[PDB]
Amino acid sequence: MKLIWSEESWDDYLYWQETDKRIVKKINELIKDTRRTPFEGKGKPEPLKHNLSGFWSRRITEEHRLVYAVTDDSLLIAACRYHY
C-alpha cells in the first residue's frame, strides 16, 4: 500500500523528525500496522463521523492522533500531530 501525505501531515511528520525521534518511531509502527490491517490493530483504530466520514484515527499519544483514510490503492495520511 502506498503512503500519500498532505502538506499538513508531511509538515507534522517532519516536525517530529526534527523534534522527537521517539514519536517518529511510534508513528512508523502505527503506519506499518495500519498498512497490514487498515481497520484493526494498534492505537485503538476509530472510524470518524460527519464531515470526517471515511477517515480513521489511531493513538500516537493521548494527545496526538494518526488520522487517515484508505482507498482501494493506498493510505491517505491526514495528520500525525494535534494542534492548538
Binding site: 503512503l3 498532505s6 517518529v24 492522533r65 493506498s74 491526514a78 494542534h83
Partner: protein, 86 residues
C-alpha cells in the same frame, strides 16, 4: 428538535436487553424519556467512541482547520507520495 427514535422509560426498562442489542446492531442512538421530563440517549459503545473521537479532533479550532484543509487536499488527489523516514 431531536432526530432519533424515542422510547418511553418503562418500555426501555422492561426491554433493556433488546434495546441495547438493537442500538448495537443498528449503530443508531435511541432517546429514553421519563414521563417527568428527564431524557437520556443510549448508544452502542462503538458508536459513542466514534462520535467522541470525531468531536475530539474538531474541538480545537487550530486542529480542525488543518485537518479540514488536509482532508480536502487528499480527497482531491493532490496528495504527495513519500516513504517513512526510518
Amino acid at each position: 428538535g431531536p432526530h432519533m427514535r424515542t422510547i418511553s422509560y418503562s418500555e426501555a426498562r422492561q426491554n433493556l436487553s433488546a434495546t441495547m442489542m438493537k442500538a448495537v446492531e443498528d449503530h443508531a442512538p435511541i432517546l429514553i424519556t421519563r414521563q417527568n421530563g428527564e431524557a437520556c440517549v443510549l448508544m452502542s459503545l462503538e458508536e459513542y467512541n466514534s462520535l467522541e473521537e470525531t468531536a475530539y479532533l474538531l474541538r480545537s479550532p487550530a486542529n480542525a482547520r488543518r485537518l479540514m484543509d488536509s482532508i480536502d487536499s487528499l480527497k482531491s488527489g493532490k496528495g504527495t507520495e513519500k516513504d517513512i523516514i526510518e
